[PDB]
Design an enzyme around this catalytic site. Structure first.
Site, mmCIF file in Angstrom:
data_model
loop_
_atom_site.group_PDB
_atom_site.id
_atom_site.type_symbol
_atom_site.label_atom_id
_atom_site.label_comp_id
_atom_site.label_asym_id
_atom_site.label_seq_id
_atom_site.Cartn_x
_atom_site.Cartn_y
_atom_site.Cartn_z
ATOM 1 N N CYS A 1 40.560 44.280 51.540
ATOM 2 C CA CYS A 1 39.821 45.510 51.363
ATOM 3 C C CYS A 1 38.401 45.599 51.893
ATOM 4 O O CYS A 1 37.758 46.627 51.758
ATOM 5 C CB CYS A 1 39.804 45.877 49.869
ATOM 6 S SG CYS A 1 41.334 46.615 49.411
ATOM 7 N N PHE B 1 46.683 51.146 43.513
ATOM 8 C CA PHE B 1 47.004 50.930 44.911
ATOM 9 C C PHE B 1 47.829 52.091 45.462
ATOM 10 O O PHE B 1 48.681 52.673 44.775
ATOM 11 C CB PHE B 1 47.772 49.620 45.102
ATOM 12 C CG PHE B 1 47.009 48.366 44.742
ATOM 13 C CD1 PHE B 1 45.648 48.368 44.463
ATOM 14 C CD2 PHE B 1 47.686 47.170 44.666
ATOM 15 C CE1 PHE B 1 44.995 47.182 44.120
ATOM 16 C CE2 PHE B 1 47.024 45.989 44.341
ATOM 17 C CZ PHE B 1 45.692 46.007 44.065
ATOM 18 N N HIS C 1 33.993 51.291 49.518
ATOM 19 C CA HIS C 1 35.395 51.061 49.272
ATOM 20 C C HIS C 1 35.681 51.157 47.764
ATOM 21 O O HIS C 1 35.135 50.354 46.987
ATOM 22 C CB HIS C 1 35.873 49.694 49.773
ATOM 23 C CG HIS C 1 37.294 49.456 49.395
ATOM 24 N ND1 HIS C 1 38.326 50.209 49.910
ATOM 25 C CD2 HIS C 1 37.841 48.658 48.456
ATOM 26 C CE1 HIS C 1 39.462 49.837 49.348
ATOM 27 N NE2 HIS C 1 39.193 48.896 48.461
ATOM 28 N N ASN D 1 43.276 53.894 45.909
ATOM 29 C CA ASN D 1 42.790 52.782 46.729
ATOM 30 C C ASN D 1 43.851 52.453 47.771
ATOM 31 O O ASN D 1 44.834 51.789 47.478
ATOM 32 C CB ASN D 1 42.487 51.577 45.849
ATOM 33 C CG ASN D 1 42.164 50.333 46.660
ATOM 34 O OD1 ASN D 1 42.088 50.387 47.871
ATOM 35 N ND2 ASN D 1 41.957 49.217 45.986
HETATM 36 C C1 LIG Z 1 40.968 48.466 36.159
HETATM 37 C C2 LIG Z 1 39.906 49.439 35.653
HETATM 38 C C3 LIG Z 1 40.221 50.831 36.207
HETATM 39 C C4 LIG Z 1 39.978 49.503 34.125
HETATM 40 O O1 LIG Z 1 39.148 50.521 33.632
HETATM 41 P P1 LIG Z 1 37.760 50.162 32.801
HETATM 42 O O2 LIG Z 1 36.950 51.434 32.672
HETATM 43 O O3 LIG Z 1 36.957 49.129 33.562
HETATM 44 O O4 LIG Z 1 38.082 49.608 31.274
HETATM 45 P P2 LIG Z 1 37.710 48.112 30.665
HETATM 46 O O5 LIG Z 1 36.784 48.250 29.478
HETATM 47 O O6 LIG Z 1 37.063 47.226 31.709
HETATM 48 O O7 LIG Z 1 39.141 47.453 30.182
HETATM 49 C C5 LIG Z 1 40.277 48.191 30.538
HETATM 50 C C6 LIG Z 1 41.539 47.534 30.137
HETATM 51 O O8 LIG Z 1 42.283 47.080 31.390
HETATM 52 C C7 LIG Z 1 42.125 45.555 31.379
HETATM 53 N N1 LIG Z 1 41.720 45.096 32.653
HETATM 54 C C8 LIG Z 1 40.748 45.667 33.369
HETATM 55 N N2 LIG Z 1 40.639 44.970 34.547
HETATM 56 C C9 LIG Z 1 41.664 43.919 34.464
HETATM 57 C C10 LIG Z 1 42.024 42.949 35.311
HETATM 58 N N3 LIG Z 1 41.364 42.782 36.597
HETATM 59 N N4 LIG Z 1 43.000 42.130 34.963
HETATM 60 C C11 LIG Z 1 43.647 42.265 33.754
HETATM 61 N N5 LIG Z 1 43.279 43.260 32.879
HETATM 62 C C12 LIG Z 1 42.303 44.062 33.258
HETATM 63 C C13 LIG Z 1 41.164 45.237 30.289
HETATM 64 O O9 LIG Z 1 41.472 43.953 29.673
HETATM 65 C C14 LIG Z 1 41.339 46.311 29.328
HETATM 66 O O10 LIG Z 1 42.559 46.083 28.555
HETATM 67 P P3 LIG Z 1 42.730 46.798 27.075
HETATM 68 O O11 LIG Z 1 42.367 48.267 27.155
HETATM 69 O O12 LIG Z 1 44.166 46.671 26.617
HETATM 70 O O13 LIG Z 1 41.819 46.096 26.093
HETATM 71 C C15 LIG Z 1 38.490 48.999 36.055
HETATM 72 O O14 LIG Z 1 38.096 47.853 35.336
HETATM 73 C C16 LIG Z 1 38.346 48.680 37.547
HETATM 74 O O15 LIG Z 1 37.878 49.532 38.222
HETATM 75 N N6 LIG Z 1 38.746 47.377 38.099
HETATM 76 C C17 LIG Z 1 38.613 47.049 39.518
HETATM 77 C C18 LIG Z 1 39.984 46.788 40.162
HETATM 78 C C19 LIG Z 1 39.813 45.987 41.462
HETATM 79 O O16 LIG Z 1 39.333 44.901 41.419
HETATM 80 N N7 LIG Z 1 40.241 46.552 42.739
HETATM 81 C C20 LIG Z 1 40.088 45.832 44.007
HETATM 82 C C21 LIG Z 1 41.335 45.010 44.326
HETATM 83 N N8 LIG Z 1 41.925 45.412 45.590
HETATM 84 C C22 LIG Z 1 43.126 44.749 46.106
HETATM 85 O O17 LIG Z 1 43.621 43.847 45.522
HETATM 86 C C23 LIG Z 1 43.665 45.226 47.460
HETATM 87 C C24 LIG Z 1 45.126 45.021 47.896
HETATM 88 C C25 LIG Z 1 45.706 46.326 48.471
HETATM 89 C C26 LIG Z 1 46.394 46.313 49.604
HETATM 90 C C27 LIG Z 1 46.968 47.616 50.180
HETATM 91 C C28 LIG Z 1 46.778 48.766 49.549
HETATM 92 C C29 LIG Z 1 45.983 48.781 48.246
HETATM 93 C C30 LIG Z 1 45.489 47.662 47.761
HETATM 94 O O18 LIG Z 1 45.903 44.544 46.848
HETATM 95 C C31 LIG Z 1 46.051 43.177 47.035
HETATM 96 C C32 LIG Z 1 45.489 42.859 48.417
HETATM 97 O O19 LIG Z 1 45.128 44.095 48.962
#
Ligand SMILES: CC(C)(COP(=O)(O)OP(=O)(O)OC[C@H]1O[C@@H](n2cnc3c(N)ncnc32)[C@H](O)[C@@H]1OP(=O)(O)O)[C@@H](O)C(=O)NCCC(=O)NCCNC(=O)CC1(c2ccccc2)OCCO1
Ligand SMILES: CC(C)(COP(=O)(O)OP(=O)(O)OC[C@H]1O[C@@H](n2cnc3c(N)ncnc32)[C@H](O)[C@@H]1OP(=O)(O)O)[C@@H](O)C(=O)NCCC(=O)NCCNC(=O)CC(=O)c1ccccc1
Lengths: 379, 378
Positions: free
Chosen positions: A150, A201, A291, A324
């Protein structure tokens, strides 16, 4: 005479998946409706995603015919590749034709091709297939960027810049295309990362024509590619990982990625602009194509750079309407910026502003920035 | 002014497979000794290979531990990748340290990295892994070339030329590395292409430092990269095909590839040198690094360019002593040329000649040429 972006075209698969409907669809078609625990978590993620709809090649019929695709860990790379090795060049072709139309020159003037995809891999590659589809000159000079991830929406502009500036008269067709069929995985509480990718994605392609010395009365620049920088954020190698496996392209996403981006953005912006004028503050003077790896990444850039409300509207608009899509997404954002700038009667393609930046973020964590100048809105 | 090659280093896995012994090894370790028909065909191919030995990471113990690797069509990509994603950067590191030594500048002076491999794929990629291994600046500007194939030894020089020439002071480390464990397949009479790959494909890595405006008395050029051209040979899409599959990197090789190369070499040579000079070239006035995809490809270039006996000695020497290692191979040939030119007391790094060419040949069929000038031996 710096390399200029001369045209941007975009394309998406025809199937629209509204986010309000995607939890129901995903859990039904993957036979996971008993996983009410996972449905709750996915509903919450989708609510936070700031993604209203996505375009996907994948259909329910493809999953019914190939249930290994939603059977976590089952062998399925071959059927994914059979799809994506065909569909990725096709979607690229559609975007390329739009860019070539805007550009207004004969396809025979294209001297260079950069094709970028993280969705498939083959030999000969997507670049070869696109040359056949478009009828490009068989002696086009090619760069085939497979599985970069990305940050590469900025990277391909950096490569195009050098190719266009060092080869007088060169015209570079840059095509970024993603079909996320290869990344689709079923649901398990041992690999919750999949819930995030399933929410965010999406599929899309961009095409950009890059060239220095625009031909008067034929070519019209949109942006100037001034300076570029690639860097690795310290201690973040676990941030985004993709392994190309028998089960498809398996991925892992650290919950700390937004914090890594926020903790480094002032530095990597400052180091980028040291290549230009030494800008070190007042980031609101810029226009931005960020991005949108997820909404929290966008929020972190806005917060740590002190951006005013609305500064990242074009970025958030694309995330909302397309999701994304990987490397092409920053080009969708530049195109959206140009379109809104026309709508608003702005003096330039960059929301009326002179200077801006593209920020690509991907595995490493790797950040590539490209400093741009806008251009006047003309023909 | 023009980008220069400032150093070349090479590396190979430690295990030496003499071709005279390889048929016995292959048929024993893959449990195919009953297929005397296939053994006869393989003996014939090896006899014509003009390859005396090869270096390979793969060992018998690895095959015993992972018999899916020699069971044709069995799921094996994951074990192959687990090996090659580690071993490709390590072998590249060895070559890069040799190139960096020759160059004689600090690693911190490298501004750009090009990593090229058709033997694996991962995210982050081999370029990232090499940055960690070498301690490259975390802000090096990177180009990661995955699964291009056998024209890429010329392609990476073309890329390095543009990066070096358009960025004042840039110093580009180029690393090509191949570990053919991902390509190893067992024998079936339905896929005889495997017999050719089993005879010719080999492991190796190259590293090249490229920069324009070498520092007087500190850096010294070996070759100048003058002009480059990439082209698709008409009607040859079936020539070389590699599909990345659950069974590994599966491949198909047309028997017509040599004839395609010979049918196009005058044209792609002529069109390449037209980028430099309007006069007609005498092909025997050049020095040559030709990708030895197999011995017949080398013979075809020699024949249709009318090259005198011995003109392609350096190419044939590397094919004999190392086999077809993919993209690194033309860099091994340039290094061999430079070494032999020293031994013979030639006036230049290109066998005493001024102008030369690198010819990479791979899928498409794609041919990339790089026009070189030699440099004085200093
Ligand atoms: C996710 C969220 C919206 C949550 O919303 P939030 O407002 O942040 O709420 P939170 O308070 O943080 O918690 C919310 C609840 O989700 C849980 N939770 C949150 N994060 C994680 C986590 N990482 N693992 C486990 N659990 C998680 C948390 O544990 C909680 O769980 P609960 O509610 O049950 O307690 C926010 O964090 C956020 O923007 N994340 C950034 C995402 C990121 O890195 N993208 C870049 C990555 N690109 C690629 O990989 C590219 C590509 C590709 C290829 C071709 C085409 C398209 C792509 O793919 C592979 C290679 O190429
Ligand atoms: C192959 C030789 C030496 C043959 O010797 P020869 O020419 O002197 O006489 P021959 O009668 O032709 O052969 C004897 C018997 O083998 C049969 N036979 C020959 N050719 C065949 C074919 N192509 N298919 C299928 N059957 C074939 C033939 O039918 C006959 O059968 P018989 O009657 O004996 O039973 C030569 O042709 C030659 O140099 N070919 C060019 C080879 C070529 O393009 N390599 C491209 C490389 N590509 C890659 O991807 C590399 C790669 O990944 C990699 C990645 C990482 C690291 C390293 C590598």
């Amino acid at each position: 005479q710096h390399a200029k972006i001369l045209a941007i075209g975009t394309a998406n698969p025809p199937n629209v998946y509204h986010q309000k409907d995607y939890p129901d669809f995903l859990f039904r078609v993957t036979k996971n409706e008993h996983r009410t625990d996972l449905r709750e978590k996915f509903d919450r993620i989708c609510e936070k995603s700031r993604t209203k709809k996505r375009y996907l090649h994948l259909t329910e019929e493809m999953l019914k015919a190939n249930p290994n695709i939603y059977t976590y860990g089952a062998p399925s790379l071959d059927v994914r590749q059979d799809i994506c090795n065909i569909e990725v060049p096709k979607l690229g072709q559609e975007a390329a034709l739009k860019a070539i139309k805007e550009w207004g020159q004969p396809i025979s003037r294209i001297t260079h091709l950069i094709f970028c995809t993280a969705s498939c891999v083959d030999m000969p590659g997507c670049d070869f297939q696109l040359i056949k589809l478009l009828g490009l000159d068989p002696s086009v000079t090619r760069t085939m960027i497979y599985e970069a991830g990305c940050y590469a929406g900025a990277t391909v502009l950096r490569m195009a810049k050098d190719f266009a500036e060092n080869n007088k008269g060169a015209r570079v067709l840059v095509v970024c295309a993603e079909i996320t069929t290869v990344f689709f995985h079923g649901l398990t509480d041992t690999h919750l990362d999949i819930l995030v990718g399933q929410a965010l994605f999406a599929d899309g392609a961009s095409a950009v024509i890059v060239g220095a010395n625009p031909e008067p009365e034929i070519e019209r620049p949109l942006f100037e590619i001034v300076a570029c920088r690639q860097t690795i954020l310290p201690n973040s190698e676990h941030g985004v990982v993709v392994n190309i496996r028998e089960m498809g392209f398996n991925y892992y996403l650290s919950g700390d990625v937004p914090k890594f981006v926020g903790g480094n953005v002032v530095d990597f912006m400052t180091k980028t602009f040291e290549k230009v004028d030494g800008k070190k503050k007042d980031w609101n003077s810029l226009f931005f194509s960020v991005h949108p790896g997820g909404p929290a990444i966008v929020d972190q850039v806005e917060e740590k750079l002190g951006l005013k409300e609305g500064k990242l509207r074009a970025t958030r608009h694309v995330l909302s309407e397309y999701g994304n899509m990987g490397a092409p997404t920053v080009h969708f954002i530049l195109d959206e910026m140009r379109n809104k700038s026309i709508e608003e009667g702005k003096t330039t393609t960059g929301e009326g502003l002179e200077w801006g930046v593209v920020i690509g973020i991907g595995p490493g964590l790797t950040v590539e920035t490209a400093v741009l100048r806008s251009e006047s809105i003309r023909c």
